[PDB]
Fold Major capsid protein.
Amino acid sequence: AYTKISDVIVPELFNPYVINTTTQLSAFFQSGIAATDDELNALAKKAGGGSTLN
Amino acid sequence: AYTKISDVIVPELFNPYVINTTTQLSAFFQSGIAATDDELNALAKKAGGGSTLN
């Protein structure tokens, strides 16, 4: 009697993925530890092959 | 009284002469090598010392 929606095939859909982000915002900065200083930039380049420094 | 490169102490022209003549004269040699690694130079010449690098 009716074309009766119970019959015609019904498609589905999809859409492109999106990137979720798990979040705990991490700062705790600036603080210890911060503040580049010199001899630490002496360890930056060699030396600093283990295990010594002061 | 004299030219006195030691008594008026010219640091040039002396210490290198000492070390070289030391190497030639005393032996051993060889046996034992001459001119080992310079990581030892890092051992005496700073930095990296402390108790003896490998």
